[PDB]
């Protein structure tokens, strides 16, 4: 809706930074609104949904099992590892590592999972092979959040990310069981409370994944809809602002309110 694009423009001007935006009909696959759709933005932790998409594709092929237990070391623990720091002794299953990476945005969980698929280059190869030749992961946690201006490492475009998420969630790539698992992890997101969720009316469905990084980088990807059923994908990114986390949160929530208002 035109009003939602105004909010996005509002946000650009108030944050002093680029904002990228896509609304995508999940059923028809039609793009409903777009803003800077072909511009690059750091993915930050939003890449963790793609990562577990790659992991689930390996589970489908039998190259990975959700119950496989991975043990690791104190040395493996990087900044912000709220779940993995608790399981040095017992290890964690692949299933638990994806849950930690997606619902809590656990950084060591994401690095361990990246190791299982062969690293950033292999995540990018996975995306390439499902028809996303735009998104690229180059680095590990936490360096992938560096968001150096004009640095294309670890970036996506709002359009690439929106269509890739649609394919992972509703397309032919993953089995029905793996699609449902991916969206189930996203629905159980615990670290995106002040964002789209804050504008979400009672009874609406949302499955999402947020991200934040250096140099004002902030974003979210989501499938949402009324009546407890997703019907739309929404992608919002920003980078470059000197604004506080709180202000960037409110801008995203404000864009959310307009999207919901004009559904
Ligand atoms: Xe979905
Ligand atoms: Xe929302
Ligand atoms: Xe934003």
Curated annotation (Swiss-Prot):
Keyword ATP-binding: no
Keywords: Antibiotic resistance, Disulfide bond, Hydrolase, Plasmid, Signal, Transposable element
E.C. numbers: 3.5.2.6
InterPro entries: Beta-lactam/transpept-like, Beta-lactam_cat, Beta-lactam_class-A, Beta-lactam_class-A_AS
Disulphide-bonded residues: 52-98
Annotated residues for binding of substrate: 209-211
Catalytic class of the enzyme: hydrolase
Bilayer-crossing regions: none
Superkingdom classification of source: Bacteria
Effect caused by changing residue 213 to S: In TEM-3, TEM-4 and TEM-8
Effect of residue 139 to H: In TEM-6 and TEM-16
Biotechnology comment: This protein is used as a marker in many commonly used cloning vectors, such as pBR322 and the pUC series.
Catalyzed chemical reaction(s): a beta-lactam + H2O = a substituted beta-amino acid
Keyword Cytoplasm found: no
Residue positions of the active site: 45 (acyl-ester intermediate), 143 (proton acceptor)
A GO term for molecular function: beta-lactamase activity
GO BP term, pick one: response to antibiotic
Purpose of the protein: TEM-type are the most prevalent beta-lactamases in enterobacteria; they hydrolyze the beta-lactam bond in susceptible beta-lactam antibiotics, thus conferring resistance to penicillins and cephalosporins. TEM-3 and TEM-4 are capable of hydrolyzing cefotaxime and ceftazidime. TEM-5 is capable of hydrolyzing ceftazidime. TEM-6 is capable of hydrolyzing ceftazidime and aztreonam. TEM-8/CAZ-2, TEM-16/CAZ-7 and TEM-24/CAZ-6 are markedly active against ceftazidime. IRT-4 shows resistance to beta-lactamase inhibitors.
Family: Belongs to the class-A beta-lactamase family.
NCBIfam families assigned to the protein according to its UniProt record, in alphabetical order: bla_class_A, blaTEM
Additional note from the record: The beta-lactamase present on pBR322 was cloned from plasmid R1 (R7268). The class A beta-lactamase family has a specific amino-acid numbering system, sometimes called Ambler or ABL numbering and often misspelt as Amber. A multiple sequence alignment was used to derive a consensus sequence and then the consensus was numbered taking into account insertions and deletions. This allows use of identical numbers, e.g. for active site residues, despite differences in protein length. UniProt always uses natural numbering of residues, hence there appear to be differences in numbering between this entry and some papers.
Protein name: Beta-lactamase TEM
Native source organism of the sequence: Escherichia coli
Chain's gene name: bla
């Amino acid at each position: 809706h035109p009003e939602t694009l105004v909010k996005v423009k509002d946000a650009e001007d108030q944050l002093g930074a680029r904002v990228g935006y896509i609304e995508l009909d999940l059923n028809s696959g039609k793009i409903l609104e777009s803003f800077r759709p072909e511009e690059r933005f750091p993915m930050m932790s939003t890449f963790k949904v793609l990562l577990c998409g790659a992991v689930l594709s390996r589970v489908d092929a039998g190259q990975e099992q959700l119950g496989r237990r991975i043990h690791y070391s104190q040395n493996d623990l990087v900044e912000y590892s709220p779940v993995t720091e608790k399981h040095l002794t017992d290890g964690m299953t692949v299933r638990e590592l994806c849950s930690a990476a997606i619902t809590m945005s656990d950084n060591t969980a994401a690095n361990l999972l990246l190791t299982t698929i062969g690293g950033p280059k292999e995540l990018t190869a996975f995306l390439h092979n499902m028809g996303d030749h735009v998104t690229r992961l180059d680095r590990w946690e936490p360096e992938l959040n560096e968001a150096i201006p004009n640095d294309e490492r670890d970036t996506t475009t709002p359009a690439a990310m929106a269509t890739t998420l649609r394919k992972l969630l509703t397309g032919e790539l993953l089995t029905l069981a793996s699609r449902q698992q991916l969206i189930d992890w996203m629905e159980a997101d615990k670290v995106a409370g002040p964002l789209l969720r804050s504008a979400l009316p009672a009874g609406w469905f949302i499955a999402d994944k947020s991200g934040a990084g250096e140099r004002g980088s902030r974003g979210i990807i989501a499938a949402l809809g009324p009546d407890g059923k997703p019907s739309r994908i929404v992608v919002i990114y920003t980078t470059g602002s000197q604004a506080t986390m709180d202000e960037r949160n409110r801008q995203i929530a404000e864009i959310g309110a307009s999207l919901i208002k004009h559904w």
